[PDB]
Amino acid sequence: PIEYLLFEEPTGYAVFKVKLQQDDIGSRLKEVQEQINDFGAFTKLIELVSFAPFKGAAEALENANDISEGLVSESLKAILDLNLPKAKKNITLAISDKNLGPSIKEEFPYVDCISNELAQDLIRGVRLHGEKLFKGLQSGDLERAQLGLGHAYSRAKVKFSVQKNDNHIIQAIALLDQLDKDINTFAMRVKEWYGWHFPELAKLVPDNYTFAKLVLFIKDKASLNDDSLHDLAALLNEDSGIAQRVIDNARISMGQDISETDMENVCVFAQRVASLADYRRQLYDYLCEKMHTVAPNLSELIGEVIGARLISHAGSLTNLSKQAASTVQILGAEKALFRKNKGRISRYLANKCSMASRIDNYSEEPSNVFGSVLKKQVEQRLEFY
Amino acid sequence: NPKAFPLADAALTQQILDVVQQAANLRQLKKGANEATKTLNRGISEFIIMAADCEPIEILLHLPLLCEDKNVPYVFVPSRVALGRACGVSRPVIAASITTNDASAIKTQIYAVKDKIETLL
Amino acid sequence: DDNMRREVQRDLLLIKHRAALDPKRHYKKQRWEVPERFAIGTIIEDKSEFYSSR
Amino acid sequence: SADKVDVMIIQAIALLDDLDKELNTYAMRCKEWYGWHFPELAKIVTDSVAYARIILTMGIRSKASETDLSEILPEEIEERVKTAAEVSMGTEITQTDLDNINALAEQIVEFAAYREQLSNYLSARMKAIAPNLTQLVGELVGARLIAHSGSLISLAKSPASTIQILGAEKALFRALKTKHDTPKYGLLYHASLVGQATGKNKGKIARVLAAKAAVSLRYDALAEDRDDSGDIGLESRAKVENRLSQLEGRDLRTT
Amino acid sequence: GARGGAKVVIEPHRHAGVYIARGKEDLLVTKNMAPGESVYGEKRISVEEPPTKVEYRVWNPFRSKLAAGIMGGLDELFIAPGKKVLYLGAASGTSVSHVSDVVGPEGVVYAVEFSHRPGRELISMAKKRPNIIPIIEDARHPQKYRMLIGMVDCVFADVAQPDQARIIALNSHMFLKDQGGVVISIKANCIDSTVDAETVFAREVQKLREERIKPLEQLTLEPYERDHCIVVGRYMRSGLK
RNA sequence: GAGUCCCAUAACCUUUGUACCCCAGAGUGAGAAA
RNA sequence: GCGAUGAUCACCCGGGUGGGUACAAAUGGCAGUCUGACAAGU
Structure with missing residues (x-):
């Protein structure tokens, strides 16, 4: 007595019409089970009459939760209303879920829901062939929508959030040290290139970042004016006296003058080193802020940079928390993060560090109150030994 | 809802602690969160007892994640000072573990309480 | 590759006869004819295993 | 003359190889870090510079609906990233995060912008210090040959055979000691002419091209009054092409 | 035993998608879908292939029961490359991640879990592995x-x-x-x-036959686990006779 | 005539410079001080 | 005015040698730049 079948698909809802009804008494016979697998026989049983795709991803999740609780979304109300004929005698609808049945009946008094094994068997067929039954109707791809909906449905129940997230910390550290290496490497090259044109400056201004900025100014050593002397004197300070030495030594040096095109790169290349240092300063401050937000307790106890390195070593804040006190100590024992009486404080700090991580990881909005008192406790231990 | 969950009642807590004190006498009790973390890792823990009044609780909330993943029962007792007294040590204890031993003289009592915690969870 | 670098060849010959390397090991019985597809790899320890297994 | 120092060549090529590595790691870092927000991009768009430009045009998946990416990506690829945007698995990110990831992206395009500038500069230098060599082997391979020897003069004092196999000492010097056959391409394998050849002709062209390379190279290094025209290379290039056409024209199979 | 720098010979297992790493000791290993990281701190094997650096993960039998099944010699596993698998009781990525490895990028895994505390960890591992739902x-x-x-x-x-x-x-x-x-x-x-134990296994097998699942094989997991057995069956809707 | 394709753009060893170490590791688990 | 939220657990004359871990450099070592007259067509 089944006449219509309702199927819920991540793309949308599909309604079918059952042309022929399969044998009830022989339902367990091998033959009636085999026809479910064969597509040639199955098409004779059911046909697609309607398909209403969801408007968007957000709609799919709303119906995914509504279907989970056995509630009838506005979309499902529409498709059934459009299809099911008005009906002494009631149109029969096959649904997978028994919990969904009463909800449909309240909305539509004239439809009877069936979810017995006969209905379950047809649903098994529809799920089995999937897009093949849609006769080319646009269901997108049933697998990609399934994947996207699954993460959406799951995280909604768990209440996953970005505030808890600490992967941002891990990425910044791997980038911060990489910036530090690259700034040094290129800054070294800037010294060599401008070293050829005027080697004595690389001795005068050892600080590379100072050297790069000064090279942007004194492109050609031949240019020497008292006004320029003041301008380069403004760069850094004359306490070292480099302002006077460069003016004097530029007048008198063995530096070999290089081409304008090569000069053009020393300033351009020095500019790139300047930008990276500017970016590295920005990224370091971003890391500092994020630790205070993510792991205020760990960051306050040891420091923003050190704690982030400890988090990266464990691979995640959660991994750090689950570890025992002994394991955390050897976690930073390769870079001496925590460093006989010297060893005792290292071990003592390790236990407190492990305690700090637990508070950060399992609190939705960690505060820094416990981290400070934890640190003062270490300070008293520090004074004692 | 509360982070410390589930919390054993007065009737159960006295039964739990009575097992704790005997396990201490038989050298089958591990005391402290760090010890309890090791036992779960080694898979030698019968079940974990925790203190619900730990200040803050968060310093022992890594155990439930370990306890469930290994399918080891766990329970909260209201008092840490009382739990420490049961353990046989002179300081409060926030977490304890009952080591696994099928040859223990107190096997039946451990299994009796272990059933109650499973139902309570 | 058909080159069959002698360093690789000696490695596999040192695994066919691994029972005699150490007098306290005494592995199971097996033949291990050289497979036609294999690769050589280096283990990477966990950072937590710095003292134990590194 | 300031325009005839080879030490700029050896540093320029050394810097270029360093840049190709660092630009790669930064491109990689952006792919995981921004891929957190939207992991499906890396599979769709593979080019690093293109990937960075997507972040620049649209900061967040929400912008994918209205933001137009046509200049970066073709039509069929560009709609894919729109479809992935609505169904994606990634987490939303704060503006503080976006500014930092956005800053990293600008470094990617900036380095690519500067990398091509360095390549052009090396081309100008190679065309001014050894113009004949560039006409024959090419600027990029030409620079590496100079850098391997350490100086233009030292390469000039090397015979043609060494220049053929300059970049394959390990294979060569392994082969000599063990009484096996020796390599035949070395560093010149990336020369344009050798690429045009096929089969065993690659080895023959490598021999012919290397011999002419030494002639064009020696005229570059030891000529007191060299004109920056490359005429010796250009006529040398014609001979190699003629040898190539005749060498390729022959067919082993019987007709 | 299997220390850090030691070299090993990786060869294919009888089951597709599973590999053996020989040496002084033998290790069951599966190819890593997300190289460069470990999900539960297992040892990993890095191989250079033309050159791209592939990575392998060690499968610990004492942590995953399925791995104990391989070691004891299960004749048939329906988990194979390019097959959809429904994993019930996915506490975390300890064993699902290895199952995700075997099926390959083409296959998928539907990890089902109830408790939320491990679920958050299951989602986190899932993002690294696209083929896990x-x-x-x-x-x-x-x-x-x-x-x-x-x-x-x-x-x-x-x-x-x-x-x-x-x-x-x-x-x-x-x-x-x-x-x-x-x-x-x-x-x-x-x-x-x-x-x-034996009665429960005998009792449990009977329920499967009632539920139209034909049991093909039962294996006990000792010495890795006590009181455990893995039963492999085929879902024969047509008939179990 | 002749192995680019086991990164000579490299690996390994030695020397120097710098910064740390001379305790155990799945570390142990109820003592310490007087 | 303690503690399971964790107690306890190489050499030589204040100075110098020995050994270990991370990085950088070396115009320091391994370390030595292939053969040499035929070939292709009718």
């Missing part, structure tokens, strides 16, 4: 997540509940294909602690 929902009610699961070539159930026989049946009826695989891990203490 995490379902944080009770496996006793397969209908709640029917939208999220298509047909699955095999069903693997590690759920530790007394009524697991009902869980396996309901999920198999909805999602498992005809002639599809069923693999179940049974812990006798969990089902019935009063009676001995």
